[PDB]
Design a protein around this ligand. Structure first.
Ligand SMILES: CCCCCCCCCCCCCC(=O)O
Length: 162
């Protein structure tokens, strides 16, 4: 479990709603560097199902356009860890959230050689929250990141943060 912080006592029903991907980092550059890069994903809405799973709406750049998408992260025995099913098993971990303002998460291909890893700082409103980027920088000091992006209020409101 390379990522070593997780949210204790995560109540998943309280992260429902609207989110902005204020920041992103990844273990290598090709994962985030272009607008089409594999894990350049912008989060729009989180929707926990009754059964404790988590529906995810995001935006991704695709055939020259910003495309809305739907992904379900299935719950696990561990409340802060969820599993996404594509050709591979990708865990999603919630490090910290205060529900009302911010939420940090990482996601890892387990266990791709070396190992690939992307994290994000979600915030509830289009505002550079000084405080939630502290916590996001702190959480990643341990982790090996090599690209780090952040957006301003203008891009937060456009599709695909253009
Ligand atoms: C707890 C909420 C965290 C949001 C997790 C977003 C995970 C993004 C996975 C995207 C991988 C598939 C991209 C695609 O659909 O082509």
């Amino acid at each position: 479990l390379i990522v070593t912080q997780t949210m204790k006592g995560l109540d998943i029903q309280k992260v429902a709603g609207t989110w902005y991907s204020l920041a992103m980092a990844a273990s290598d550059i090709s994962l985030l560097d272009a607008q089409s890069a594999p894990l350049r994903v912008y989060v729009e809405e989180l929707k926990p199902t009754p059964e404790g799973d988590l529906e995810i709406l995001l935006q991704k750049w695709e055939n020259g356009e910003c495309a809305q998408k739907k992904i379900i992260a299935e719950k696990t025995k561990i409340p802060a860890v969820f599993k996404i099913d594509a050709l591979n098993e990708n865990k999603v971990l919630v490090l910290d959230t205060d529900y009302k303002k911010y939420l940090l998460f990482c996601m890892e291909n387990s266990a791709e050689p070396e190992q690939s890893l992307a994290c994000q700082c979600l915030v509830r409103t289009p505002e550079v929250d000084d405080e939630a980027l502290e916590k996001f920088d702190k959480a990643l000091k341990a982790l090996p990141m090599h690209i780090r992006l952040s957006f301003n209020p203008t891009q937060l409101e456009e599709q695909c943060h253009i």
